Amino acid sequence: PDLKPIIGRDSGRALAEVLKLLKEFQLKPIGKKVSSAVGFVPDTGPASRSVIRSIIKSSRLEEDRKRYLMTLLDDIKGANDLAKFHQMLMKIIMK
Amino acid sequence: INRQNISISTLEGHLSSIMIAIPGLGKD
Amino acid sequence: QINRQNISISTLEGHLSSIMIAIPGLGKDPNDPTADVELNP
Amino acid sequence: NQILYPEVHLDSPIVTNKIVAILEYARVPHAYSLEDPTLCQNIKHRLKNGFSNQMIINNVEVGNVIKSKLRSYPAHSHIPYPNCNQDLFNIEDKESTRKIRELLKKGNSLYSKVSDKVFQCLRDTNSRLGLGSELREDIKEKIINLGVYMHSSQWFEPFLFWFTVKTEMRSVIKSQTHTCHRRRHTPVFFTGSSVELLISRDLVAIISKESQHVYYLTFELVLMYCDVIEGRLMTETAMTIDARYAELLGRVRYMWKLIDGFFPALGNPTYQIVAMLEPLSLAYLQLRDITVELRGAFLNHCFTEIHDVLDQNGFSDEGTYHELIEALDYIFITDDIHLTGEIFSFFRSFGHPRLEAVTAAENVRKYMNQPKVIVYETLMKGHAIFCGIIINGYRDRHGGSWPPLTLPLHAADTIRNAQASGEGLTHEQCVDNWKSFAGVRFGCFMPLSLDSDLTMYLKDKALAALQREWDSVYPKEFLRYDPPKGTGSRRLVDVFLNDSSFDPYDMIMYVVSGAYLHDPEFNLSYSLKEKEIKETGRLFAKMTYKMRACQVIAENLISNGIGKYFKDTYETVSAFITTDLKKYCLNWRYETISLFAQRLNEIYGLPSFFQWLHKRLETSVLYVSDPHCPPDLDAHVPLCKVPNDQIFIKYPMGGIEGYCQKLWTISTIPYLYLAAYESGVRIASLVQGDNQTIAVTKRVPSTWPYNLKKREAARVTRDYFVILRQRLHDIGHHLKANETIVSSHFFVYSKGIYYDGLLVSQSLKSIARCVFWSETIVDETRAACSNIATTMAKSIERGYDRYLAYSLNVLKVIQQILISLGFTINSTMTRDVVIPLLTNNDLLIRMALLPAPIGGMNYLNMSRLFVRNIGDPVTSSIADLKRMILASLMPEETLHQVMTQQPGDSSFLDWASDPYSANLVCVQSITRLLKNITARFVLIHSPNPMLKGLFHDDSKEEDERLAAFLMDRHIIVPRAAHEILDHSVTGARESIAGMLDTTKGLIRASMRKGGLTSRVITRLSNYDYEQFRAGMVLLTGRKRNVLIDKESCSVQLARALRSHMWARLARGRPIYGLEVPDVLESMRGHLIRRHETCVICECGSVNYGWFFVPSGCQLDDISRSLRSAVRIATVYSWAYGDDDSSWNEAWLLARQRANVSLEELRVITPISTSTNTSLVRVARYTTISNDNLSFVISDKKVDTNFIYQQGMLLGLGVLETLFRLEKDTGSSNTVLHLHVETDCCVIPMIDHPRIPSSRKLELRAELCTNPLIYDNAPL
């Protein structure tokens, strides 16, 4: 809004969070494509790759199919394609 | 008065949403 | 004609009342030692 | 000062400054890096000065011994804690444990002789209950060879080593710290087979022969290693002899071997990975979710942190991280649901980190010095919900009215007319027009609960030193100057029971008047907290006396007053959110709490009272003080001139955890309710322990799939979470997404992990704590063998096997007895008991198999395996003994020795305060006796106005006289005497003296001041010696009671036992109302399968509990108002009964309790017709019909003779121990019959309406009007 007043504990003791235009230190928005406490969205990072691997491992499919999905994961690169494979696997698991 | 009413109600409209800035040290 | 602005003045006063209770200072006795002294002596 | 043995278990933190100080004064080289070099610089400068005392001299001599022995080893290297963990966990010596090895070998050869009969006696009980005719051939082998399993374990030799070292250092410390003899011999190394020991009084030096490594340890490290290994050995044995943990054993063993391999490389930061097994055990349970979008949500954060810790530590390679992640996957990924909370039990068995003060002060300074920007609109929208909650909480309980309540100023029409009409208002109106509550001023309508009890003040707390002497905690060694001496006391009870003028209103006015802001003595200090697996973790705060008193007073006010207002087709479906409240009290500024403290100021009528915390903190300095980390100060300075550095936190803003808990808890609900209204979902919060859960709930159509129902119930809370996060961030709180869980199935609490109606309990948390010596002040075999049997019975209810837990208890008792007889530091164990007992093998196992209510040392009887409370200890122990004699575990003459043993010497008050006690010679606890003596003495000698006029030295004689008058009649009733005496003013004194928890320091002070005589010291310094002598006499005595046989019922046996035991106070008069038949002897059983006809039913019995279970794959998922101490008088007058004449005496005692007349008393008492399931998984399927069991003795208008719930608990127990190893409940539906027989158990009694009091009633000269003592002005 760029228009929000600010009153501090004292007159001149508000110079800390006045420059953070840039008035309040907001919070990072929980987006549908950013990993947060709600929902899973995989990045390119090894953390996310290992999490998808753990989902394949702890899923309740058959062993050969689990290994085949692992092989499919071995040759995937890029956050976008990784997210597509994640959606595919989530669709497959409940089938 | 017909104008002063809104000219003073806008003050309350703007004051009903302010930001309190708490410092880091209790004495400074 | 007048009560419609008296309500606004009272709303502003009630905002400034509870806005200087949650901010220490800003007056001579601006804090809240304004309760009934005690039920028992 | 010799009745105090050194500590046996770990109770303090491991401070690296401690070891650094010891080694730097002993002049030994050491590879110990310190964050702050101030301690080393201080010690160095002090040595250059020339300061030295006896401790310095002793450490110098020990260091000389170490440095002279280190010459034989050319390439020695100090391996520091925790890098030495992998070695010192698997250390083993063969020429140092030469004694304890033989001891435990003998203790195992005794069990090898008793074990076949133990198994036979358990198989008898099983077959009797009706679980077949033969135990599992695996269970038989485990029970019989349970000693060989415990001896062929990988932790046995480390256990022997870390027990030998522990007991040797304990003996050294005990024999040395006593001022008897001062001439000391230097300690020399003990060259063993593979290691070389030097057990000094302060530090232990262990050199490794082949490896050349050198380790220096302290008493805390030795205690921690002994605890860790005694836990690992017990848990590995309990998972080896058991079959349900056949899969868990491999995972836990791999976890041990995998995280042990990081200690040599990673070091101290390895506990940041060890402390990641509590969140991971939930992140890996989320992978079974039903809304696939949530799977991995928490696991991503867990793995991100596990990667960041490795990167910051230095293991930047990717191979190490990948192998670690694969290992953790293998460990945690599993199928069974009930074995997912088990890895929780094991994450405390890697030891505790070594911590300092700087790294725990900076972590809290970072959070307490931080600006914030709150939002006024949402602050007031929450304050409106607060005012609305108060409005509704007072309009209820008062018939919909606001007599003293709010008086708005410019309120809206609906909210102004709600007051006039005297009706409530929901969250909708408040959040809609919160502008109406923008200036509401309450008026005092809440009294001040003043003299409820003394809990808050009496509960042991520490006090900080007065601000003028804030550095008296640091001894003169580690400081660069002479610190000021410490005048004031250092305990809440020591400063409270010496308060010549105490007044809660004086304290409240000390806050109201505002002298707490000018008090030149206020001081707040931080202290590191022991047994935490986080290097920063937590601290606990200590503040001065007056301020601590005002704090506890404020918390009691806010918990007794409005704090109680906040307690509370289409189906409902609820998800769960769980977030931990650590580091959540430092984000509580004054601005966000003043609007809620002000309404409470105006409710209780205490101007500017309820916001004392921030007004005091915002102008004070708090340092973190431990005796070994001093500040760097060349000369003494006040606490206001110290800079903002290592240990100081100048002028904080946030709160302090624990203080104002009720205030924060009631001021945090308005924002939950606002965020719930903004989404249209009904929530319910629960703060249980250290993490709060919220059960968001929504109504959904019934004719829906379970999958879609749970998916929508998770979507609604995924929406609610962001709203709540925005609200908390606008009021100033960060609801982090890393430390939080959202899940549609589970939530953590303090009784396990609730998972969709189940409960994944952790059974191996108490087996890891059934260590040898129990927590006490003097090593006592009775308390040890009671703590050994009080934890197996908890593992049994959390999921362990009954028979294997019983055998483990028997074995651990048999070797605890031997350790206390021939491997103890006690000095009063003489050859007249040590030699005969250790020589006679049969007697030594008889004393360890004989139950404790009879005279033995076995505290776990075969009925405590199944039911929660046994009926009568003395009639259940005799049934247990009969079972043992029948199964030929003990000879027949033991029953005669029991029934003709030597009666002890106890008075009437002891029989009235312990009513099930067939009196025994020298059985009580030395700790309990010292507590009940010192508490009584210090409460009699106290000028405190709160409890004055209550503790006069004649109180003991008055108690004994009242007990004699109550018990002594023509028919004795110990239970009723106990109830009356407990509720009287003689039970109030004992309750206060028990609440006054005396510490080792307090008993030391009492002995220094002469609290108890040297005669009592000599009487209680050789107690356990008398226990063993009395047991020897009991088991050797050769008498016979010709009227005793195996066939006479256990009830008759217990009656005869009590009569013969104290006829000196009975003279033949019947004791009545104690004996209740034993459940396991009285109840037989049978299991009806698909096609068969019952046999014990058709044999004639028609009284039996009927349990049913169907077949289906499960076990995975599916003038009197606002009562007061007048209630004490009421329950007493009902326990006395209805009497023609003795109603006068009942009224007399109830009058001494509370002020009321006989007529009001008779009309208030409820005259009666007489004169006197969250633990298992197969109780959901179970169906119970109580109809056939309704047959009791005449089934008249009385209570159930046997506790009716026993015949149901004992049925659920057998059903659970049947389906314990099955995944499904079978193919055919099963039924269970639980016939009972109490024929000969019926006491042939004469129904006395009441007994005439055959003693004159003498009471206190006048009932004292102390208001703490039951009130004497109700109306």
Ligand SMILES: Cn1nc(C(F)(F)F)cc1C(=O)Nc1ccc(S(=O)(=O)N2CCCCC2)cc1
């Ligand atoms: C502001 N807030 N929002 C939420 C929500 F909704 F997100 F869960 C929770 C809180 C909140 O925790 N208040 C609060 C409650 C108790 C304490 S404590 O000091 O007594 N404590 C210390 C740690 C162990 C337990 C006891 C400190 C702050």
Ligand SMILES: [Zn+2]
């Ligand atoms: Zn019987």
Ligand SMILES: [Zn+2]
């Ligand atoms: Zn039957």
